[PDB]
Amino acid sequence: DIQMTQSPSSVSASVGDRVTITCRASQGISSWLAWYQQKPGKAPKLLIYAASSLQSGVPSRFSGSGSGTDFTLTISSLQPEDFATYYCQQANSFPFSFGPGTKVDIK
Amino acid sequence: LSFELLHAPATVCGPKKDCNLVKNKCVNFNFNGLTGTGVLTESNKKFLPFQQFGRDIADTTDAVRDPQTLEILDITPCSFGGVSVITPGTNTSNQVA
Amino acid sequence: FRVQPTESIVRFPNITNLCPFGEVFNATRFASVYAWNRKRISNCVADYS
Amino acid sequence: PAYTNSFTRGVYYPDKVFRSSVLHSTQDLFLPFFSNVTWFHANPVLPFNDGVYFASTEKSNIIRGWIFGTTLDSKTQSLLIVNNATNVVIKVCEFQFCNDPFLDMESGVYSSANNCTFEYVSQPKNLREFVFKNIDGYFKIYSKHTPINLVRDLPQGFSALEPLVDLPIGINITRFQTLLALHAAYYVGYLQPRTFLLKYNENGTITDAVDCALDPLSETKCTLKSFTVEKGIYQTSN
Numbered sequence: 001d002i003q004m005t006q007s008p009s010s011v012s013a014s015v016g017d018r019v020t021i022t023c024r025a026s027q028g029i030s031s032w033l034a035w036y037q038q039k040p041g042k043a044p045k046l047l048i049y050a051a052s053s054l055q056s057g058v059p060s061r062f063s064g065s066g067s068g069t070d071f072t073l074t075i076s077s078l079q080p081e082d083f084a085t086y087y088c089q090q091a092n093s094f095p096f097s098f099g100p101g102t103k104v105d106i107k
Numbered sequence: 108l109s110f111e112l113l114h115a116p117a118t119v120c121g122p123k124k125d126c127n128l129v130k131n132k133c134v135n136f137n138f139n140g141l142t143g144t145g146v147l148t149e150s151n152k153k154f155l156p157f158q159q160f161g162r163d164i165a166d167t168t169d170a171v172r173d174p175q176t177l178e179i180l181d182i183t184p185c186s187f188g189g190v191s192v193i194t195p196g197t198n199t200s201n202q203v204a
Numbered sequence: 205f206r207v208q209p210t211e212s213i214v215r216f217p218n219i220t221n222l223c224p225f226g227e228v229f230n231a232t233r234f235a236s237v238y239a240w241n242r243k244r245i246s247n248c249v250a251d252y253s
Numbered sequence: 254p255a256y257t258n259s260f261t262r263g264v265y266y267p268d269k270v271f272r273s274s275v276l277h278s279t280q281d282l283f284l285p286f287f288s289n290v291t292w293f294h295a296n297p298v299l300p301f302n303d304g305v306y307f308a309s310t311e312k313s314n315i316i317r318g319w320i321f322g323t324t325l326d327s328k329t330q331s332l333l334i335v336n337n338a339t340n341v342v343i344k345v346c347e348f349q350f351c352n353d354p355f356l357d358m359e360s361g362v363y364s365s366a367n368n369c370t371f372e373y374v375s376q377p378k379n380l381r382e383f384v385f386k387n388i389d390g391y392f393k394i395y396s397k398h399t400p401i402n403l404v405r406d407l408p409q410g411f412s413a414l415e416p417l418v419d420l421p422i423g424i425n426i427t428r429f430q431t432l433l434a435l436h437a438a439y440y441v442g443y444l445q446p447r448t449f450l451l452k453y454n455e456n457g458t459i460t461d462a463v464d465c466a467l468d469p470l471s472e473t474k475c476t477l478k479s480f481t482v483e484k485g486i487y488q489t490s491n
């Protein structure tokens with residue numbers, strides 16, 4: 001059992017800003033992590049997996065980083081449709097545990 | 108799984124299964140290596156913590172501490188003896204006691 | 205006249221610290237052959253049944 | 254150094270057998286009654302002749318472990334039985350050490366980090382008595398904590414030492430030394446085979462014992478298997 005304790009509870013930003021979301025684990029999930037975008041009213045979608053990868057279809061502005069215990073997801077060209085909550089699902093231990101969530105607003 | 112043997116004492120070694128404890132019946136017992144036959148009953152004897160089993164004057168084991176639960180059990184050999192037939196003589200009757 | 209024993213019982217201390225083979229044969233992700241991983245299991249009661 | 258006499262001290266339980274009101278007689282290693290034991294007050298290395306009787310009256314925790322071995326090097330093991338403020342560690346490791354080893358981390362562990370085998374943690378105004386022997390690859394320790402006050406020599410009385418734990422090290426030991434907390438009176442006595450007549454009371458606790466080789470009266474007591482004898486002539490030995 002591994003718990004997701006990502007530090008940013010919520011981040012305030014606007015269009016054309018820089019936002020970094022840091023996810024924290026408790027054991028060796030060094031290269032088994034995924035990121036998801038959850039727009040209200042619809043199912044989540046995958047954008048980053050294996051802590052460094054780009055899903056086929058997503059734009060080239062979301063980049064995963066970090067290895068070991070800490071993991072950071074960074075965006076450099078924030079766009080209004082990207083405003084949602086983010087989760088860092090693990091993949092090391094088989095009982096996968098999702099993340100708490102991180103809301104981003106319009107400011 | 109690669110096992111290996113060495114002069115050092117073994118640290119990984121197999122388990123020892125146990126049977127449920129029964130009393131008031133002559134049953135063979137193996138209490139942590141003590142082998143014998145007798146009737147096991149609850150005992151009021153007071154054992155020191157390190158002491159494991161008791162002996163009598165004639166060096167015959169009488170009390171043993173159960174390994175799983177720290178309680179004292181008295182070992183009593185199950186009954187034996189002789190059989191004697193009481194008869195009034197076949198010249199009078201064939202009924203015996 | 206002699207009564208013979210009816211059952212045979214054996215008592216041994218509680219089996220504790222069973223060996224951790226559960227992780228080895230059940231882990232979600234095993235290693236690639238070139239990097240075979242070695243786990244030294246020690247000080248334990250091992251049951252292969 | 255100084256010589257002091259042990260007056261009926263160093264009797265332990267030779268086995269884990271419960272005996273009630275039995276005058277058992279046993280043949281094992283015991284410290285002879287009324288035998289001189291060397292007094293130390295500083296602490297060099299000492300031999301290990303089949304067993305050693307350790308007694309320390311220090312009220313502080315300066316005495317905090319012991320070391321054992323025969324030709325102590327990085328190739329052979331050693332007994333590290335140091336006493337921490339909250340626990341103890343049983344470190345049997347193939348290490349050597351420099352001269353004058355002690356504890357202030359340890360002063361001897363500077364070079365004592367080679368090929369260690371087995372580890373264990375068991376143990377966390379009065380007299381501390383310890384008996385150490387190593388037989389058939391088993392190391393046995395007996396301890397007793399008796400309150401002694403305002404007495405110079407060993408107290409006049411009887412106290413039975415109870416075993417702590419037996420450890421299967423299975424190595425050779427010839428030299429013995431304590432690890433004094435260098436940041437000091439303790440007695441040493443050696444055990445040789447002797448015949449003892451232990452007296453168990455109704456609770457299984459040893460109350461008094463007789464040394465079967467001290468004087469003819471004790472041999473007479475041992476022959477009759479009683480602690481008291483009556484008027485008469487008794488044949489004891491040949």
Ligand SMILES: *[C@@H]1O[C@H](CO)[C@@H](O[C@@H]2O[C@H](CO)[C@@H](O)[C@H](O)[C@H]2NC(C)=O)[C@H](O)[C@H]1NC(C)=O
Nearest residue numbers: 125128173174175176177178216217218219220
């Ligand atoms: C050996 O295992 C048995 C089985 O659990 C233990 O028995 C229990 O001990 C606890 C501890 O006090 C009690 O609360 C339970 O009621 C006991 N259950 C039974 C069925 O006896 C036993 O204590 C263990 N012994 C040791 C030395 O660990």
